[PDB]
Scaffold this active site. Structure first.
Site, PDB file in Angstrom:
ATOM      1  N   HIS A   1      40.398  68.397 -20.637  1.00 33.20           N
ATOM      2  CA  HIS A   1      40.929  68.509 -19.235  1.00 33.20           C
ATOM      3  C   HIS A   1      40.936  67.162 -18.563  1.00 33.20           C
ATOM      4  CE1 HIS A   1      40.381  72.710 -20.047  1.00 33.20           C
ATOM      5  NE2 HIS A   1      39.080  72.604 -20.039  1.00 33.20           N
TER       6      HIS A   1
ATOM      7  N   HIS B   1      41.598  62.713 -11.990  1.00 31.12           N
ATOM      8  CA  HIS B   1      42.845  63.460 -12.185  1.00 31.12           C
ATOM      9  C   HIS B   1      43.974  62.495 -11.968  1.00 31.12           C
ATOM     10  CE1 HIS B   1      40.599  67.310 -11.592  1.00 31.12           C
ATOM     11  NE2 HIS B   1      39.851  66.469 -10.910  1.00 31.12           N
TER      12      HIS B   1
ATOM     13  N   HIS C   1      36.659  61.702  -8.830  1.00 28.38           N
ATOM     14  CA  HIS C   1      35.690  62.627  -8.303  1.00 28.38           C
ATOM     15  C   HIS C   1      34.337  62.284  -8.857  1.00 28.38           C
ATOM     16  CE1 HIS C   1      39.051  65.832  -7.667  1.00 28.38           C
ATOM     17  NE2 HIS C   1      38.958  64.969  -6.693  1.00 28.38           N
TER      18      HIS C   1
ATOM     19  N   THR D   1      39.118  73.229 -10.810  1.00 31.08           N
ATOM     20  CA  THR D   1      39.410  73.822 -12.117  1.00 31.08           C
ATOM     21  C   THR D   1      38.651  75.110 -12.214  1.00 31.08           C
ATOM     22  OG1 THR D   1      37.576  72.647 -13.217  1.00 31.08           O
ATOM     23  CG2 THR D   1      39.802  71.683 -13.326  1.00 31.08           C
TER      24      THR D   1
END
Ligand code: J4K
Ligand code: ZN
Length: 258
Positions: A62, A94, A117, A197
């Site tokens: 991810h 991201h 993050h 998520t």
């Protein structure tokens, strides 16, 4: 579960396994700078990362996570909207396929190229897994990235990515200093929200810095050579691993600054 970011398993599908996807405090959100209000009761923010001990970098299919030793109060976030002490456990990003998208939060509907993050857990709950079950369990410090000048403090991260190209790969990653990823100013917006998520738990105090950091096109280009797949599977580039903005609902975004 095989959630992801493609057409068939992406954010619009997540609600079928994770109904809290359509909850009352979902993240990310658009930050409307003209509606967020300065809150003079926010205490000053305290980012205390001098003793941060990084351990390892992992491609989890991810994103890539830089993980820290959080078995004692080594790197903590305190102050601002937060009550008590929040321990740094990891950071990740991201990002997009193109420089004009990639961030989760948006600012007056502006998308940045990426978003960092830094994830911290409330030490009153004793471990991370207990913390995520609490409405005040986590504090995530969010930092926008824009493409311009290189960020020198990012380069050690960029340079190890070749070694964790595919899902399930990790590499030793010690002595990385996350202070090098911070902007000059700690002015921020804050609101209550969620993980972005699955499992999408509503356990996060979001603290989003107003000042983006600049990274170079070459640096973000290297993020985009990662893979969502495992080794020996068909190549799917790790790009566009961001959830779009979710309804604000009954929440106020507070500014630390006038
Ligand atoms: Cl430990 C952790 C790692 C990644 C992650 O990605 C989703 C997310 N990102 N920011 N808030 N939730 C959440 C928690
Ligand atoms: Zn994240």
């Amino acid at each position: 579960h095989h959630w992801g970011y493609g057409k068939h398993n992406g954010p619009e599908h997540w609600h079928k396994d994770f109904p809290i996807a359509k909850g009352e405090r979902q993240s990310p959100v658009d930050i409307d700078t003209h509606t967020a209000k300065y809150d003079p009761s926010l205490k000053p923010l305290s980012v205390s990362y001098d003793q941060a001990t990084s351990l390892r970098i992992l491609n989890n299919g991810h994103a890539f996570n830089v993980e820290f030793d959080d078995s004692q109060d080594k790197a903590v976030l305190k102050g601002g909207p937060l009550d008590g002490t929040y321990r740094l456990i990891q950071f990740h990003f991201h990002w997009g396929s193109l420089d004009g998208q990639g961030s989760e939060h948006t600012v007056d509907k502006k998308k940045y190229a990426a978003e960092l993050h830094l994830v911290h857990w409330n030490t009153k709950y004793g471990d991370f897994g207990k913390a995520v079950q609490q409405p005040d369990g986590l504090a995530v410090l969010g930092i926008f990235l824009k493409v311009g000048s290189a960020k020198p403090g990012l380069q050690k991260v960029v340079d190890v990515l070749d070694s964790i190209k595919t899902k399930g790969k990790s590499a030793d990653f010690t002595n990385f200093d996350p202070r090098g990823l911070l902007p000059e100013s700690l002015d921020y917006w804050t609101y209550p929200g969620s993980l972005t998520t699955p499992p999408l738990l509503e356990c996060v105090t979001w603290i989003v810095l107003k000042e983006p950091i600049s990274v170079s096109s070459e640096q973000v280009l290297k993020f985009r050579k990662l893979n969502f797949n495992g080794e020996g599977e068909p190549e799917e580039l790790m790009v566009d691993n961001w959830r779009p903005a979710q309804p604000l609902k009954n929440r106020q975004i507070k500014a630390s600054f006038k």
